Amino acid sequence: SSMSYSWTGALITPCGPEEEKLPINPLSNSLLRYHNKVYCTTSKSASQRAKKVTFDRTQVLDAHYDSVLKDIKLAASKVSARLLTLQQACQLTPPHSARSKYGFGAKEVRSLSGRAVNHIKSVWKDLLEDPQTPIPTTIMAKNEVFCVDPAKGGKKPARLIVYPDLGVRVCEKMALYDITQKLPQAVMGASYGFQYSPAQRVEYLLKAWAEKKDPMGFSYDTRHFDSTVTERDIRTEESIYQACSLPEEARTAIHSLTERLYVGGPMFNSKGQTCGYRRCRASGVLTTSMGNTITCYVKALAACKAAGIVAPTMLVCGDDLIVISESQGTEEDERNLRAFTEAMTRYSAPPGDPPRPEYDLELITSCSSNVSVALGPRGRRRYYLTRDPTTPLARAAWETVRHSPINSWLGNIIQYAPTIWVRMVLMTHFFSILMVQDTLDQNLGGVNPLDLPAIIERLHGLDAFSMHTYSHHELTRVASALRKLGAPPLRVWKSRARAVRASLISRGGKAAVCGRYLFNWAVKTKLKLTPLPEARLLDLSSWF
RNA sequence: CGUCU
Numbered sequence: 001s002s003m004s005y006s007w008t009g010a011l012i013t014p015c016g017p018e019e020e021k022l023p024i025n026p027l028s029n030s031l032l033r034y035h036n037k038v039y040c041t042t043s044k045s046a047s048q049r050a051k052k053v054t055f056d057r058t059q060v061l062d063a064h065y066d067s068v069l070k071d072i073k074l075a076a077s078k079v080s081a082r083l084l085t086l087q088q089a090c091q092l093t094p095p096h097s098a099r100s101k102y103g104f105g106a107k108e109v110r111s112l113s114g115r116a117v118n119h120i121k122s123v124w125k126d127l128l129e130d131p132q133t134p135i136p137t138t139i140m141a142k143n144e145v146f147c148v149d150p151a152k153g154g155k156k157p158a159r160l161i162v163y164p165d166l167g168v169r170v171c172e173k174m175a176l177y178d179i180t181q182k183l184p185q186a187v188m189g190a191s192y193g194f195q196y197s198p199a200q201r202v203e204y205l206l207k208a209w210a211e212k213k214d215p216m217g218f219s220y221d222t223r224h225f226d227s228t229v230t231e232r233d234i235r236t237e238e239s240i241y242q243a244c245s246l247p248e249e250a251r252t253a254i255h256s257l258t259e260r261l262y263v264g265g266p267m268f269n270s271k272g273q274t275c276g277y278r279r280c281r282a283s284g285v286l287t288t289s290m291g292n293t294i295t296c297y298v299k300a301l302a303a304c305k306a307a308g309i310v311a312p313t314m315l316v317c318g319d320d321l322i323v324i325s326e327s328q329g330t331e332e333d334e335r336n337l338r339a340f341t342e343a344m345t346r347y348s349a350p351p352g353d354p355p356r357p358e359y360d361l362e363l364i365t366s367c368s369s370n371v372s373v374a375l376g377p378r379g380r381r382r383y384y385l386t387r388d389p390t391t392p393l394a395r396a397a398w399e400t401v402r403h404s405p406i407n408s409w410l411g412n413i414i415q416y417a418p419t420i421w422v423r424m425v426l427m428t429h430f431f432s433i434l435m436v437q438d439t440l441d442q443n444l445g446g447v448n449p450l451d452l453p454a455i456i457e458r459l460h461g462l463d464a465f466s467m468h469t470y471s472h473h474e475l476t477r478v479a480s481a482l483r484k485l486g487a488p489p490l491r492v493w494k495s496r497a498r499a500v501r502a503s504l505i506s507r508g509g510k511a512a513v514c515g516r517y518l519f520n521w522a523v524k525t526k527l528k529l530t531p532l533p534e535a536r537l538l539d540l541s542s543w544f
Numbered sequence: 545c546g547u548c549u
């Protein structure tokens with residue numbers, strides 16, 4: 001049947017010179033040694049990611065799909081949505097957003113400049129009326145930093161990103177932005193993944209897993225999920241959008257966006273030639289993150305009934321997904337997950353790595369993270385969220401003229417602040433750099449470094465300063481990830497942080513706070529860390 | 545490029 005893409009042969013060009021590493025990486029050449037292993041996915045490789053994602057999709061839905069889709073449309077019934085004033089939509093355009101062909105950019109859209117407000121008024125007028133003629137879209141390579149894995153091919157090709165003009169993107173928010181805010185939370189309930197915070201996700205899977213008389217979990221993600229999206233899939237997506245209370249102007253524009261934009265259309269490279277025709281999800285539209293999640297919930301929930309997964313609890317975050325269900329004996333469980341994958345490929349959502357049932361919560365990985373255990377200050381099992389530190393580390397060493405990595409360090413130091421690798425490797429190197437730079441209180445990312453103990457206690461609680469025995473898996477992984485990248489062994493970071501703690505305490509003030517809290521683990525003789533006044537005297541909602 | 549915390 002349908003082919004996800006049909007190419008013209010025109011290279012996917014780069015929309016701006018690509019960064020090259022320098023002969024000295026001054027910030028990270030103490031963090032790790034093997035810089036030759038850290039790469040970035042240029043548009044050269046885009047040529048070859050194209051091959052990976054072009055193929056012949058063919059679905060075979062069945063009574064299990066159609067039973068789910070029906071009650072999901074019944075969830076959609078209880079949702080009331082509203083249009084978005086052309087102004088309000090312009091106000092939600094991101095500040096660095098890519099400018100429009102027709103001479104105006106994000107700065108002009110957000111300040112309601114006259115020229116932009118008229119062009120968008122006419123785009124939205126072409127959206128109403130003309131419901132058939134496609135909307136031209138642009139196709140970009142996406143540059144990303146990784147570590148080479150010789151096992152799995154050496155260097156990943158660049159993911160492909162496809163987006164309409166800026167005029168169109170404001171119109172999408174008009175038609176669909178309010179939908180996105182309500183629909184998934186309504187159709188999927190507690191199974192909606194983006195809803196939870198890192199601590200909340202953990203509390204969930206822990207509850208889901210103890211609620212079983214004999215738990216069994218697995219994760220499933222589909223391969224090339226943007227490409228496995230058939231046209232019927234998108235139109236059945238609209239079928240759910242339209243099931244809510246919409247002003248009639250919404251339905252017209254929605255229906256026209258689904259035809260002219262979402263179901264496919266031409267594609268042009270940054271140079272401007274014709275590049276191909278797309279017949280799948282264009283990753284890079286408003287619905288992308290929500291369509292993905294909803295479609296995935298349907299196909300998943302369908303396949304759960306086909307295979308007979310019993311009492312399953314779910315957690316969908318886009319096309320990543322995890323099911324904690326009731327074990328049916330080992331050898332039925334293996335048979336069911338094959339039925340599961342079987343349905344999921346008859347739904348045009350084949351897997352990547354084939355799923356496998358696991359009976360220990362640490363071995364399930366969804367959204368590039370897993371759950372592990374450590375011991376808390378009192379001796380209690382503390383469950384946190386961790387990951388394979390390979391890619392965060394490779395990114396800590398990405399250092400060109402344009403890009404500086406200190407953001408990458410903080411972004412992970414916060415997100416994964418309880419993990420052994422952050423506590424010992426990232427935090428040690430972070431303060432070790434800023435004390436020497438003497439830039440120990442800039443405003444990196446709208447954040448101040450000297451607040452980290454307060455921020456961390458706000459988000460992960462005081463135990464992130466006092467967690468000590470680490471799970472065997474997590475040790476072997478951290479140890480081996482450092483080894484893979486040239487970084488010192490954990491032993492060396494223990495000594496390095498012992499000293500970074502010294503300079504921090506001795507600097508006094510808010511610095512000495514960081515030294516005693518973030519590096520309690522380093523000292524021979526701990527200090528009993530009490531809560532901080534800023535466990536509420538810190539606004540809990542600047543990003544969370 | 546889009547969504548999100």
Ligand SMILES: *O[C@H]1[C@@H](O)[C@H](n2cnc3c(N)ncnc32)O[C@@H]1COP(=O)(O)OP(=O)(O)OC[C@@H](O)[C@@H](O)[C@@H](O)Cn1c2nc(=O)[nH]c(=O)c-2nc2cc(C)c(C)cc21
Nearest residue numbers: 402403404405407408409410411412414444445446447543
């Ligand atoms: O490696 C990432 C990541 O750790 C952090 N980052 C980016 N986006 C987010 C979100 N949504 N939540 C949490 N943390 C985030 O910063 C790194 C990305 O920046 P990068 O260095 O890759 O790009 P540039 O060098 O072009 O720009 C420097 C940025 O650091 C800067 O723009 C800053 O504003 C990043 N930043 C956000 N940026 C953004 O556009 N939107 C957001 O909502 C952002 N939120 C945050 C939140 C925090 C806590 C930080 C530290 C930075 C953020």
Ligand SMILES: Nc1nc2c(ncn2[C@@H]2O[C@H](COP(=O)(O)OP(=O)(O)O)[C@@H](O)[C@H]2O)c(=O)[nH]1
Nearest residue numbers: 221222223224225226283284288292318319546
């Ligand atoms: N626009 C955009 N979409 C993304 C990005 N990453 C993931 N997605 C979407 O979410 C889906 C999840 O895919 P992923 O698990 O990252 O890898 P894949 O399934 O092999 O393509 C993708 O097909 C995209 O549609 C991104 O950086 N930008």
Ligand SMILES: [Mn+2]
Nearest residue numbers: 221222223224
């Ligand atoms: Mn995937």
Ligand SMILES: [Mn+2]
Nearest residue numbers: 221222319320
């Ligand atoms: Mn995924």
